[PDB]
Design a protein around this ligand. Structure first.
Ligand SMILES: O=c1cc(Nc2cc[nH]n2)[nH]c2c(-c3ccccc3)c(-c3ccccc3)nn12
Ligand SMILES: O=c1cc(Nc2cc[nH]n2)[nH]c2c(-c3ccccc3)c(-c3ccccc3)nn12
Ligand SMILES: C[S@@+](CC[C@H](N)C(=O)[O-])C[C@H]1O[C@@H](n2cnc3c(N)ncnc32)[C@H](O)[C@@H]1O
Ligand SMILES: C[S@@+](CC[C@H](N)C(=O)[O-])C[C@H]1O[C@@H](n2cnc3c(N)ncnc32)[C@H](O)[C@@H]1O
Ligand SMILES: [Cl-]
Ligand SMILES: [Cl-]
Lengths: 381, 381
């Protein structure tokens, strides 16, 4: 009684949608290295033999798109036709134009940086939960770590039949606790990973349990009843873009909270700070995490929204699930007094002209690596 | 006290991401008209002068992609270079391959239809709320209707300066009510719509208030304090794919609940029923709506999840926000007794081989038109 199941998923660095996110952010970073004020809206599409860049960039940088794209694919591990994709020999097509002058004039032309308008309308959420030290849902943390473990064992050569494309999924049984949530046990794990033509199914399934799951998931969460779906399709030799087209911004729940909290729909990768889809979502995470680490809440969801061309958010809302002694109205006043959510101020607080974005584009944007939005602000109230 | 703001957005038929969703589903429908068992995973990308189809289709149909794509763009209204895009003269590129044989063998080859495996892993949610008769959040309903009104007034010639690309956003002040939510008033409305070079800003803003907002939003929700951001960028002559690249599956929150409920990350358009991202999300909506219309709950969220190749969901979970006298455990038993969420049964219950998908691809997939997933099931318990 009072228990429920909840499932989240993650994907690996060579999952075709994630390839696109990483390439889009490699392009962003390449621009920002030369022009910190570059306006970038770079979408990537991947299919057999093809990376296409489409979108809008206005920048003083001189960027070699062939080199940037191919080096990103190399880093991911697609380096031979036997793996289904090769950075050395794939097609890289570019359909990039300047940013629309109508957008530019309405957003940032002749505006003081702090008073730049939002680059679009939209809604964004931030979420934090005390169930893990990194203030993230356990389901998504574990799912990400299973993909990272696969990449580790591929790159270190101990499971050399692995290829870069993978997906994982973790179902946890939770107990509710005064609006907070408490993980009890892992109910089901799925792992699917691209593999070579020689390794057999039983070798893979044994390795995925013993060398992947047991190396990631604490034994206290695994029991005789846990269900394992390891290579459930039976065969995954064809993978990467050859198996499934990829696009930027098609893993937005993997990028965020694994189904927990809420999402406003905007993708992160390929976008400079003036695109509030990214900057305001990062700021909202920073607010949520600051509220939890500051001891005001155990679990919290923050919504913000914007209109194109308008600097201040149109709305700010907080929901604490019953996990604060303060009302949400009081928390909102605390947030108002401690944070300025104009994009031209967020950029300063979170250092969003720095070319660190490719690092955000796999394994989730939140809960990792002490990025600026992961360092709580000390709140005055 | 106890009130909060919440914002949702919608986009019009000519918004570039929505163009792609509609084209992807026009392709799906064209296949299904000839081959009800077509396996379709069609992504669309749009930029200046270009529609690209990328993905995987295995089908007995003979489909003229040039005709299907161009007729969809014609229907949307992009028929002249003066509007930034023209179905008669744009480039249509095709990068479509067969479905991966490794996927096919693990999902559906040599399987009884009722026992076909899920076409992928993933998680999906369904949501319903008694705050409107269509069991949808008021924020998203109003946002969709504002876009539909723009298209109506464009197509009937009374605002002939309108073009097909639009976005809207509605912020509502709500009161919480025993786990349910009650709309009080509209706090802020945003409308941005592409327009011709001749019309002036004041004419547009006056028309958007008097002919669009007042024709859609009941006066009881609008007051002296409501904030209007109408053409907030100041100029939106460049639009459609020329202003911003579009991709399929980049409006997944517009397609669903406007930020309410939850989302598992999967896109709907371009996918046949074996892709649980669509079929299981439709079934989960059907469950949620059945629970609310059956008087068991006022508001409910349902999660399901799958593993590729496995027919039955790996998890099913229900959360009623405190709006039922029954426990969630009891509701779960009711759902288990009344629904079979295998994809090969959902297809029968919801008639998912029928070529009605292009109709779902603008103005949201839920809350409209008495699609099968919108007709509640009578529950036995
Ligand atoms: O706070 C609570 C307390 C609670 N108690 C019980 C008890 C039996 N079932 N549920 N269930 C939940 C859920 C949830 C559970 C299952 C399915 C869907 C949602 C969520 C939630 C998660 C993600 C996004 C939004 C909301 N929060 N949440
Ligand atoms: O049931 C309640 C009761 C409630 N009461 C108050 C009172 C003051 N603030 N909130 N707020 C909420 C929210 C919510 C409100 C603002 C920001 C973010 C979420 C949601 C919700 C919406 C979408 C997705 C998931 C959850 N549900 N919900
Ligand atoms: C199953 S494919 C999506 C459906 C696909 N577009 C089709 O044509 O049926 C989605 C993701 O699952 C993974 N995948 C690809 N082939 C797979 C296989 N044979 N077995 C398991 N997972 C696979 C890859 O990560 C891929 O990006
Ligand atoms: C603002 S554009 C996104 C940012 C863009 N990719 C860039 O290069 O800055 C996103 C959407 O807003 C709308 N849009 C395009 N131009 C606009 C304008 N001048 N004013 C307001 N909205 C516009 C269109 O619906 C478009 O798909
Ligand atoms: Cl996927
Ligand atoms: Cl957009």
């Amino acid at each position: 009684e009072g228990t429920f199941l909840f499932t989240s998923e993650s994907v690996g660095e060579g999952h075709p949608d994630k390839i696109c996110d990483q390439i889009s952010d490699a392009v962003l970073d390449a621009h920002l290295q030369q022009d910190p004020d570059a306006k970038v809206a770079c979408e990537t599409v991947a299919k057999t033999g093809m990376i296409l860049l489409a979108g809008e960039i206005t920048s003083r940088a001189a960027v070699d798109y062939q080199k940037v794209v191919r080096e990103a694919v190399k880093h991911i591990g697609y380096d031979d036709s036997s793996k289904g994709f090769d950075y050395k020999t794939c097609n890289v097509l570019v359909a990039l134009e300047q940013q629309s002058p109508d957008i530019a004039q309405g957003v940032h032309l002749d505006r003081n940086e702090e008073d730049i308008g939002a680059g679009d309308q939209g809604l964004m959420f931030g979420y934090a939960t005390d169930e893990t030290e990194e203030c993230m849902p356990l389901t998504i943390v574990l799912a990400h770590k299973l993909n990272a473990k696969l990449a580790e064992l591929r790159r270190n050569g101990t499971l050399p039949w692995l290829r870069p494309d993978s997906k994982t999924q973790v179902t946890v049984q939770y107990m509710q606790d005064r609006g907070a949530v408490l993980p009890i046990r892992v109910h089901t794990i799925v792992i699917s990973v691209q593999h070579d033509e020689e390794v057999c199914l039983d070798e893979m399934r044994d390795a995925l349990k013993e060398k992947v799951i047991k190396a990631v998931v604490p034994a206290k969460y695994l029991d005789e009843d846990t269900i394992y779906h390891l290579q459930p399709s039976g065969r995954f030799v064809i993978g990467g873009p050859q198996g499934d087209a990829g696009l930027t911004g098609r893993k937005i729940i993997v990028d965020t909270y694994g189904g927990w909290g809420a999402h406003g729909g905007g993708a992160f990768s390929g976008k400079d700070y003036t695109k509030v889809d990214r900057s305001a979502a990062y700021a909202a995470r920073w607010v949520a995490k600051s509220l939890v680490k500051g001891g005001l809440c155990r679990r919290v969801l923050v919504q913000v929204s914007y209109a194109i061309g308008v600097s201040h958010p149109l709305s700010i809302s907080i929901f604490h699930y019953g996990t604060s002694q303060k009302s949400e109205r009081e928390l909102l006043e605390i947030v108002k007094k401690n944070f300025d959510l104009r994009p031209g101020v967020i950029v300063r607080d979170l250092d969003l002209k720095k070319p660190i974005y490719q690092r955000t584009a796999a394994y989730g944007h939140f809960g990792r690596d002490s990025f600026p939005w992961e360092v709580p602000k000390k709140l005055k109230y």
